[PDB]
């Protein structure tokens, strides 16, 4: 059948797990709220603390689906079934279905509320196959899908930064900031066509990934530690005159153990320190722009973006480089707040010393160098799956230090809006009918997956629940589980979330 | 046709009765209430009386259909048509249909209520073919289908015990109860996919049974009483010196009557007595666990489950072993309260004596023994049809003492939920739209049935209404019948409900 | 483990009274009973096995 | 040979939310106190086979 | 099954021929599986009292010994007329012809 | 659920170096000490009964 | 040949103990080969082969 | 060797000590040869000039 009163599609989920691939299926309940009236504005965000960056941005009536995270697509068991049982995996494809839509027509008699349901109403649904438009999705952000089904999924408003607020602020003069103010592009999702849906209708979307593997594997030794220490080496060490304390120059054969190596450590930036008060964008490395004239307020600050984490690789000094996240919107300064940790993988730590003719002294920087090896960030269940690689003429190796992934075309963000229904007036307008939509997204994605075999004699390592710990309310219930009170207990610190790359082994 | 305004299926019932099989058909009106918001929690049930067991359990938004009982599928005449006319029967198959759904959208203006009906709403319906998930159905419980049609059927919330509350309580220390607390599984019905239904849609489910016959038959003599008492026997009795009072040892031939037998009595446990106050789970036999360390509060109690009835077989001493049930939720301590009784079948009673060299003394226990014969509990119209045999490596004969049946895969429990419809807010959430579902289940099950023939000359026995008695309001109306006032009069004590195994006969 | 048996009992009373050392009997809940035990049910022979 | 774990005893399988139709007769205690009474089995802690 | 009282029932093995009285000497432990522990109480009309024995009974469920990497795979089931369920308490296995 | 980590394992032999299933220096295969070292089946996964 | 630790490395075991519900040996194939008969000799003390 | 040496404490060097892999050339199969037998091996190179 078809029409109102006939559901379009059913609920879906439960994953799969075949040796060659893993099919994860998920379904949600969402609602679209009519953000920002239906008009756009700009909003010039800022806190005040007027010294802040005060990015101008743009607001839109649209809301969007963010599917990017692992904890959305994998249960704590599905994750840890692949983290234990497979070398590597990458998402092969993605299939999304909007269906079972509802338009409920908010009413207010004062106080209270009433919902009359509705028919003869519509919902705009738009997808990016070209990745035109500023593509809201940023790897970390918030939201994505609730890691836990049955939990309704509130969409978030779509917005974008047209241009840096400073540089076009603009200060008196200028014509250097007059341009870059004149050139700010203005994007609208109306433009390119998109589907409207009443209740009985649904929509599907597919995606394919040109995508790099993410490897769950562990190097038990540094790459420079590979050699037979029993066998002597043919090589020699000349050592300069020490010039205090003592021990004039001599040449000698390199010991059989501790043979020299190629294979430099991976790059990192360790020298900087985060600058100034919070909410001011303290990154310790600001990329900025600095056009030749322009004009600039206090800052630095205040222009450009903080680079985080430096690192990458190159084991950090203190917590300041160690990433962090709250895994919860209610998270206060210290609460939630699980902090990344070392995988104990040997790749992946990578100091560098140089110096002194007397002592070794850990060195800041370590830029790119020909023989370098590093290991991509071990990630974890809480991480974003992908990140969009911005289109540009030239680029280097492209390894994001957030883990995640880089793709020319990631999954196109699916945008959805409430289809303004106006109402007559004398003035006339601006007035509209207050409605919201509700429905079910099913994100079914296929994962290219590869299973591990090794010649190691020893048991290696897995992810037990014993890394997990008890929490919530009265302490009862362990970790991934409901409260009484039921509130899903969040995993506390890093090992709870079970990172890949801490298990198996690989001969380098 | 199709869609709203076209009923999906019609009412069904009235049974069948062919010699080879009996088809019982039933239809109901049910409603799903949105239990437990849509969140799960845990609920740590307990009374207080904090000394109680205080099982933690888990609550779910789901409700389920329990079809397990005889009085649901058989009218008092349909039952007693098979109990009189057939040796044995077992359910062959089962067919269930949800249809004629309605979502009525509860409203409250304060006091009162209003129901706007609704469209563009949905209902989740999920079935277990694999019997993954904890499967709420327990043989006795409550509810099932109302034995009487036209009586609306209120569903009950689905919940399960993740782990024994004690042992993980946990007391200080521990790491023995830390494990078993960490390992508590958490099951969710979202997971595996399931169908959502608007009004116009329906759903069917089928089931097949690998199932043991339940026998309606009577042994007119004990199995050890089978012999020709006229014919002399070749056998002898040596009797030890009596050592007080008198009568020194002698050997003699066994009398022609009262020949010795094989065929030991069925097993039972008669020694124990129920322990302590009610609501504390007094079973007289507690299975428990007792891990080697753990920790334990007062109890025993308090851990594990009471084994009921011991018995089995092995005619009990007092009422304490005799089972009982109230056949009514309104039943107080003594009200309703029909108590099981002896079938007068001879199988099926089974004392055992041993002792003393002087006197025989009824013996407690009687575990399993090679030649034992017992007769499965005679059941009655009020009993559960089946019980799930839990998956385990090893097990013994598997005869449940509740009567009923054991199956690897019983009928998969059908789960149903109200499909949370959220509503927008600032906070935002947690908020949802208040609705309920209403519809018709038709459970049509086929019974493999076998008809009796015998060479007995005499009339045997049947189930008359004369076993029944008058009751309700002013005494008028007999037993299975409406009051004035109309309330279905319940059968009082055991013979009213007409048990199988009290009729026909069988030569052993 | 060894095979099962019942060794504790002793045959009870005079001959012709059915002395089995193990009487299966019945014992319905009320009924009525004369002297015996005895006298109801059958002697189990041989325990052993 | 089965590698698997039962998270609960076999007698612990039931929905503790749902009430049960069953009753407990308890004999006269004959010291200390609490003469015999019959009562419905609590929704939690239902009796078991197995 | 039927979780033991003290070490005396807990099995043991030395996993080494050089093992002295206490050396090597790894001792079996509870799997924490719930099948598999199985007390039984009975008694008293007042208190429950853990009961010795517990022979075979119709509705019984137990879980076969959890074994481990150190265990024998199989054991030969001796040829005889009659036998019961045949679950060896060493874990392992029983076969007509190993 | 639960798996078998090497973290159940522990260090041993000679001077304490080398963990558990591994050679000594001296090489003698270090034996697993107590029960969890040897990784028993039936302590993992789960089953609905 | 009867033991698990003979046929499974500490990793092979724990690969099945973690990843599988159940297992039973399906079949077995044994091969004696590369035989040598070395003829012990003793001249007193020592030995020769 | 350092990092798993290990100094008192530790559980950071306890791990990385527990995880040390142990490789054996017995494991994967290989050929045995008496005198009369020989063996060949080939290799191909994906290789830069």
mmCIF file of C-alpha atoms in Angstrom, chain E residues 1-97:
data_model
loop_
_atom_site.group_PDB
_atom_site.id
_atom_site.type_symbol
_atom_site.label_atom_id
_atom_site.label_comp_id
_atom_site.label_asym_id
_atom_site.label_seq_id
_atom_site.Cartn_x
_atom_site.Cartn_y
_atom_site.Cartn_z
ATOM 1 C CA UNK E 1 29.641 -28.763 39.701
ATOM 2 C CA UNK E 2 28.139 -27.828 43.058
ATOM 3 C CA UNK E 3 30.738 -25.291 44.170
ATOM 4 C CA UNK E 4 33.142 -26.952 46.635
ATOM 5 C CA UNK E 5 33.729 -26.157 50.282
ATOM 6 C CA UNK E 6 37.503 -26.145 50.590
ATOM 7 C CA UNK E 7 40.617 -26.721 48.497
ATOM 8 C CA UNK E 8 40.313 -30.476 48.985
ATOM 9 C CA UNK E 9 37.710 -30.706 46.190
ATOM 10 C CA UNK E 10 39.164 -27.990 43.970
ATOM 11 C CA UNK E 11 41.334 -30.300 41.808
ATOM 12 C CA UNK E 12 44.953 -29.124 41.341
ATOM 13 C CA UNK E 13 47.943 -29.975 39.147
ATOM 14 C CA UNK E 14 51.647 -29.249 39.039
ATOM 15 C CA UNK E 15 51.972 -28.638 35.259
ATOM 16 C CA UNK E 16 55.573 -29.836 35.688
ATOM 17 C CA UNK E 17 57.286 -33.082 36.701
ATOM 18 C CA UNK E 18 59.764 -31.155 38.844
ATOM 19 C CA UNK E 19 56.853 -29.822 40.895
ATOM 20 C CA UNK E 20 57.277 -30.374 44.630
ATOM 21 C CA UNK E 21 54.446 -30.319 47.174
ATOM 22 C CA UNK E 22 53.906 -26.574 46.787
ATOM 23 C CA UNK E 23 55.579 -25.469 43.527
ATOM 24 C CA UNK E 24 54.067 -25.454 40.100
ATOM 25 C CA UNK E 25 50.798 -26.402 41.685
ATOM 26 C CA UNK E 26 48.213 -24.314 39.879
ATOM 27 C CA UNK E 27 44.804 -24.770 41.446
ATOM 28 C CA UNK E 28 41.448 -24.694 39.700
ATOM 29 C CA UNK E 29 39.191 -21.717 40.345
ATOM 30 C CA UNK E 30 35.596 -20.676 39.809
ATOM 31 C CA UNK E 31 34.783 -19.525 36.251
ATOM 32 C CA UNK E 32 32.311 -16.994 37.718
ATOM 33 C CA UNK E 33 29.843 -18.548 35.279
ATOM 34 C CA UNK E 34 26.514 -18.897 37.033
ATOM 35 C CA UNK E 35 25.614 -22.437 36.030
ATOM 36 C CA UNK E 36 28.252 -24.044 37.501
ATOM 37 C CA UNK E 37 28.167 -22.977 41.168
ATOM 38 C CA UNK E 38 25.009 -24.613 42.443
ATOM 39 C CA UNK E 39 24.610 -24.861 46.155
ATOM 40 C CA UNK E 40 21.559 -26.540 47.636
ATOM 41 C CA UNK E 41 19.978 -25.753 50.969
ATOM 42 C CA UNK E 42 16.787 -27.575 52.048
ATOM 43 C CA UNK E 43 16.177 -27.151 55.812
ATOM 44 C CA UNK E 44 15.241 -26.203 58.421
ATOM 45 C CA UNK E 45 11.813 -24.610 58.649
ATOM 46 C CA UNK E 46 13.976 -21.831 60.175
ATOM 47 C CA UNK E 47 17.401 -21.731 58.474
ATOM 48 C CA UNK E 48 18.763 -23.107 55.212
ATOM 49 C CA UNK E 49 21.576 -25.636 55.631
ATOM 50 C CA UNK E 50 23.875 -26.588 52.756
ATOM 51 C CA UNK E 51 23.257 -30.257 52.028
ATOM 52 C CA UNK E 52 25.749 -32.990 51.197
ATOM 53 C CA UNK E 53 25.148 -35.307 48.228
ATOM 54 C CA UNK E 54 22.545 -34.060 45.733
ATOM 55 C CA UNK E 55 22.352 -37.108 43.454
ATOM 56 C CA UNK E 56 20.715 -37.075 40.030
ATOM 57 C CA UNK E 57 17.261 -35.515 39.816
ATOM 58 C CA UNK E 58 14.938 -34.963 36.831
ATOM 59 C CA UNK E 59 15.196 -31.215 36.311
ATOM 60 C CA UNK E 60 18.888 -30.804 37.036
ATOM 61 C CA UNK E 61 21.138 -28.542 35.013
ATOM 62 C CA UNK E 62 24.865 -28.275 35.501
ATOM 63 C CA UNK E 63 27.623 -26.938 33.324
ATOM 64 C CA UNK E 64 30.448 -29.198 32.259
ATOM 65 C CA UNK E 65 33.808 -28.390 33.801
ATOM 66 C CA UNK E 66 35.174 -25.221 32.138
ATOM 67 C CA UNK E 67 38.496 -26.975 31.413
ATOM 68 C CA UNK E 68 41.529 -24.923 30.316
ATOM 69 C CA UNK E 69 44.548 -25.257 28.036
ATOM 70 C CA UNK E 70 46.177 -27.798 30.387
ATOM 71 C CA UNK E 71 43.427 -30.381 30.263
ATOM 72 C CA UNK E 72 43.149 -33.722 28.519
ATOM 73 C CA UNK E 73 41.022 -33.532 25.405
ATOM 74 C CA UNK E 74 39.269 -36.887 25.718
ATOM 75 C CA UNK E 75 38.780 -39.889 27.968
ATOM 76 C CA UNK E 76 37.674 -43.353 26.941
ATOM 77 C CA UNK E 77 34.186 -44.352 28.016
ATOM 78 C CA UNK E 78 34.528 -47.966 29.193
ATOM 79 C CA UNK E 79 32.314 -50.523 27.497
ATOM 80 C CA UNK E 80 29.498 -51.629 29.766
ATOM 81 C CA UNK E 81 25.853 -52.598 29.568
ATOM 82 C CA UNK E 82 24.360 -49.625 31.391
ATOM 83 C CA UNK E 83 25.509 -46.116 32.210
ATOM 84 C CA UNK E 84 24.191 -42.696 33.195
ATOM 85 C CA UNK E 85 24.591 -39.304 31.498
ATOM 86 C CA UNK E 86 28.404 -39.667 31.198
ATOM 87 C CA UNK E 87 29.735 -36.225 32.042
ATOM 88 C CA UNK E 88 33.343 -36.562 33.266
ATOM 89 C CA UNK E 89 34.185 -34.177 36.078
ATOM 90 C CA UNK E 90 37.708 -33.746 34.733
ATOM 91 C CA UNK E 91 36.177 -31.888 31.850
ATOM 92 C CA UNK E 92 37.699 -33.691 28.878
ATOM 93 C CA UNK E 93 35.358 -35.915 26.883
ATOM 94 C CA UNK E 94 34.036 -39.442 26.654
ATOM 95 C CA UNK E 95 34.116 -41.480 23.473
ATOM 96 C CA UNK E 96 33.298 -45.066 22.611
ATOM 97 C CA UNK E 97 36.460 -45.199 20.517
#
